[PDB]
Design a protein around this ligand. Structure first.
Ligand SMILES: Nc1ccn([C@H]2C[C@H](O)[C@@H](COP(=O)(O)OP(=O)(O)C(Br)(Br)P(=O)(O)O)O2)c(=O)n1
Ligand SMILES: Nc1ccn([C@H]2C[C@H](O)[C@@H](COP(=O)(O)O)O2)c(=O)n1
Ligand SMILES: [Cl-]
Ligand SMILES: [Mg+2]
Ligand SMILES: [Mg+2]
Ligand code: NA
Ligand code: NA
Ligand code: NA
Length: 326
DNA sequence: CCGACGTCGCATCAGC
DNA sequence: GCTGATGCGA
DNA sequence: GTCGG
């Protein structure tokens, strides 16, 4: 990419602030700056040129000047040589190990993949599975495999109850030629903002996908959100496909458009759009868009009949899913 | 200068 | 058990 | 770390 060196450096800084410093707003600031630089259609010549972009300030401009002049950033080169920072950044790559648990493990002398496997009994369930599939979860999914996965989910869901509608969101819905995992929005007419007329609506789908050995493991599971592991079937004498993360979100059928806007993302696009809503006097979640009163208290849900209605309320021109990859 | 920064589901833990 | 953080995740 | 009042 045009500015890949700069955006990589900002991403590494973001991950430092999140995993090591536990400064969530610094993390989002670095990610927002990397995003706006990622879509800037010129090869950046200076920090001052970049500071013109929203989300790039004085400090990142200076880092950009250091990186443009030397090809590196001293702050990162020192971070890379710090053993505690190295340890924590590695452990937080296991699903279920966040900043706090990573620092606690380092305190207990658990700092490597070998240490983690030595101490499985010190892991909760999510972490145990994240460690089990550590290699697999860092692999990307070709869109072709995403299409085979889509076919299985959609047909198995239709076998449970043909009134379900399952929609693959995330980067897949944004047209990506590869995805890091599969995100499935699910609706059923028995589950609306008004009533739940049928129980186990998510569970029944999960059970069916386990029964056919597509879903292989469960990280967390509630009434509306499943987070787990899945695997494509391989052919005779074929090497197995990697295991993949899968997220399934059951959304009230009448709130599908807010739900699919949320689950299509990206995460940064959602942050930018929800921040814009607030400046416009609305708050958006995966269910509703609502006005804010002078109170600052959210009012009653506004009528929504398309993703575009959401954009219109906040005075944004519509953006197709493929233009939301911020 | 400095308050706000997106919003919420599930797992875990502490306090009663 | 309930309730309210806190952690980690979408 | 950046931004907006
Ligand atoms: N912090 C977050 C994380 C996710 N989300 C939403 C948007 C996001 O697209 C959706 C799916 O989460 P993912 O983490 O899978 O994000 P994807 O867009 O699918 C990516 Br590009 Br990171 P992939 O999973 O393909 O690697 O959930 C969010 O709103 N806020
Ligand atoms: N998971 C889904 C997907 C779509 N739908 C509904 C919302 C709209 O009425 C319509 C969307 O049609 P389309 O597939 O063109 O996006 O189907 C749903 O209720 N649940
Ligand atoms: Cl709501
Ligand atoms: Mg995804
Ligand atoms: Mg602001
Ligand atoms: Na700027
Ligand atoms: Na992690
Ligand atoms: Na996901």
């Amino acid at each position: 990419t045009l500015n890949g060196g700069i955006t990589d450096m900002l991403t590494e800084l973001a991950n430092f602030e999140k995993n090591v410093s536990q400064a969530i707003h610094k993390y989002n600031a670095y990610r927002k700056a990397a995003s706006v630089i990622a879509k800037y259609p010129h090869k950046i010549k200076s920090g001052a040129e970049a500071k013109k972009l929203p989300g790039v300030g004085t400090k990142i401009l200076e880092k950009i000047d250091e990186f443009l002049a030397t090809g590196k950033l001293r702050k990162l080169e020192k971070i890379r040589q710090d053993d505690t920072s190295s340890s924590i950044n590695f452990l937080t790559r296991v699903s279920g190990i966040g900043p706090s648990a990573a620092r606690k493990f380092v305190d207990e002398g658990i700092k490597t993949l070998e240490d983690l496997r030595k101490n499985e009994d010190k892991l909760n369930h999510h972490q145990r599975i994240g460690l089990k599939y550590f290699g697999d979860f860092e692999k990307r999914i070709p869109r072709e495999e995403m299409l085979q996965m889509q076919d299985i989910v959609l047909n198995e869901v239709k076998k449970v109850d043909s009134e379900y509608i399952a929609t693959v969101c995330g980067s897949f819905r944004r047209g990506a030629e590869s995805s890091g995992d599969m995100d499935v929005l699910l609706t059923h007419p028995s589950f609306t903002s008004e009533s739940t007329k049928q129980p186990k609506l998510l569970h029944q789908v999960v059970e069916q996908l386990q029964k056919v050995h597509f879903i292989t493991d469960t990280l967390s599971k509630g009434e509306t959100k499943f987070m787990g592991v899945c695997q494509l079937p391989s052919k005779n004498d074929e090497k197995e496909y990697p295991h993949r993360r899968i997220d399934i979100r059951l959304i009230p059928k009448d709130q599908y458009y807010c739900g699919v806007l949320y689950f299509t993302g990206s995460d940064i696009f959602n942050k930018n759009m929800r921040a814009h809503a607030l400046e416009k006097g609305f708050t958006i979640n995966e269910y509703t868009i609502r006005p804010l009163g002078v109170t600052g208290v959210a009012g009653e849900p506004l009528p929504v009949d398309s993703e575009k209605d959401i954009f219109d309320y906040i005075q944004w021109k519509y953006r197709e899913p493929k233009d939301r990859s911020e």
